[PDB]
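so ive been stuck on this for like two days lol. basically i have the seq below and the ligand is KNU, smiles is in there too. i just want the complex predicted, nothing fancy, no docking runs or whatever. if the output looks off dont worry ill sanity check it later, just need somthing to start from for the group meeting slides
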Amino acid sequence: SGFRKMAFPSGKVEGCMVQVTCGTTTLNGLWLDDVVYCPRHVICTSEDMLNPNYEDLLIRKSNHNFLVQAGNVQLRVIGHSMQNCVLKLKVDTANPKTPKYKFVRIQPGQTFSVLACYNGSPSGVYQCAMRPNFTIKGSFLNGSCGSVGFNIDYDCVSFCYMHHMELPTGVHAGTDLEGNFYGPFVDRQTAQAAGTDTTITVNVLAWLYAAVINGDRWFLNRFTTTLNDFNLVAMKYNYEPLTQDHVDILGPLSAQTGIAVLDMCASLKELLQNGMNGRTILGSALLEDEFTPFDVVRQCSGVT
Amino acid sequence: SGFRKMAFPSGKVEGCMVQVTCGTTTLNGLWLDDVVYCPRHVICTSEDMLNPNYEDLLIRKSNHNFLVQAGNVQLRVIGHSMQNCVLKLKVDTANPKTPKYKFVRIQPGQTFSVLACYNGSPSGVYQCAMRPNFTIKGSFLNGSCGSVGFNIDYDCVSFCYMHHMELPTGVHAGTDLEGNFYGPFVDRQTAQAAGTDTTITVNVLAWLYAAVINGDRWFLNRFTTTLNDFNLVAMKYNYEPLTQDHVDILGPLSAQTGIAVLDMCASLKELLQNGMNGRTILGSALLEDEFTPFDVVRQCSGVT
Ligand SMILES: *CC(=O)N[C@@H](C)c1cc(F)cc(Cl)c1
Ligand SMILES: *CC(=O)N[C@@H](C)c1cc(F)cc(Cl)c1
């Protein structure tokens, strides 16, 4: 037992990290098969970032201007193209460590692991969720651009995020591996503000089920509620509305614990209205929302 | 910017995980060079665990009774020995993926990453601290025995923990890689209780410095204190006493932020006495103590 914010083992992704340099700008790239993916702003100077015309800046770049280094060895770039906000650099060598992979575009509320990298070298791994305002709260310093987010289904890595930028409020924005930003963000040094960062209700419920499985049961109340009644309280507290799709996904946790989904909603409603009163749940003094129902099942069952 | 509970990239350790089976008992082993390390209770039945005599149970075991599987291939065991609470199985093949490594015995308050494994296969990675009562609060299910804790200094893995057991209160106990338990725990199914789980004061201070670096400054107060005065409050709140050695280690964070260590102690004293008043620091409603001063420096500087 015990419940931790756990990331996927990062080895399969570490084997894909490379350094990409264009002129004086260096960031990370993801090398899968014979293609290196990286943020297109690798072609920009600090001045270019204020109002970049990427197609125009790219005209001044040839294959030899992109320096790709894997470990301490240079890869030969034989092609390059821009797809949305990412560049795809075709190299002459397939990555021998390419895992089985997919590119997926996730929904808000979904979680993933980030392998933060600098100069193509991994520094650490942590667990994130795509916030309902399409930002992530990561840990990214200058040069972390190009670090990726992913999930693993046994031996298949599903890449869902590539880091591009930090908003003036310190939250993060990036794209899927097709180069499309999550949310309305653009890769430009212009002030962009995030919308309301609401709480991912289905994830808090999943985490309350993890708490019961792990022996933290004090918050269990004697009430039940309905979706409509719960959602009136969710709205007041800036929680995401709960739908029958979320109730369906919590079914296995409801089955394992014998606690009906709506009863757990009623316990959450009381926690929102009464607060924690200085108590903790799974060592947290706030309601955690960065575990999906699948994450809780996975961690409580021991999937490898 | 942003500050996350970050684990070391786990690839170097994933390449060392194997499955060890003795009779009907299966757990994880760590394969480094031509030796596989695993908890000695791999030789026990459930009945043996109530009062095991390990030297006696080991007399009934030969090299061929230990089945070691790396991926889906069997390793040949050519020797075996018991060192404290671990078995060392000499195999005929050196692990080709053996990273540069050391075995270290950590002090309470020190943090490390755990690669939780089942059947020799990695399930996830998370960050722990050795608690002041020599337990860790991990996430370990049946079969996680043998999973290891480690730190990385660039390309050298320092293994500090091997998981052995869960106390009846759901906290975890294990050994260093020489088989010596942290704390007073024994590898027997007998009720063993943990001592006071005090808060690692030097780590909370480090995390308050991380909060200031990352823009969370509301808790900064207009006071200072002395070590003796602070420690009177630390004692009352079950925090570890702060020594000049801890002040010395916080020096670089004090230098980077311009906040004297004793002034940060005074801000922590006010947080202990006043509480958070419903506010958060780095997204937490409690004072986090599982980041050392070195972890904060590393994460805020981008070490790979
Ligand atoms: C990774 C990162 O933060 N890159 C910087 C240079 C940046 C700034 C900016 F205004 C927009 C983008 Cl996409 C990237
Ligand atoms: C990894 C684990 O929990 N192993 C179990 C079988 C166990 C039980 C016990 F009472 C003592 C030890 Cl060391 C291990």
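The domain at 198-301 of chain B is CATH 1.10.1840.10 (main proteinase (3clpro) structure, domain 3). The pocket of KNU (ligand 2) is lined by residues B 41, 49, 144-145, 164-166, 187-189 (CB under 6 Å).
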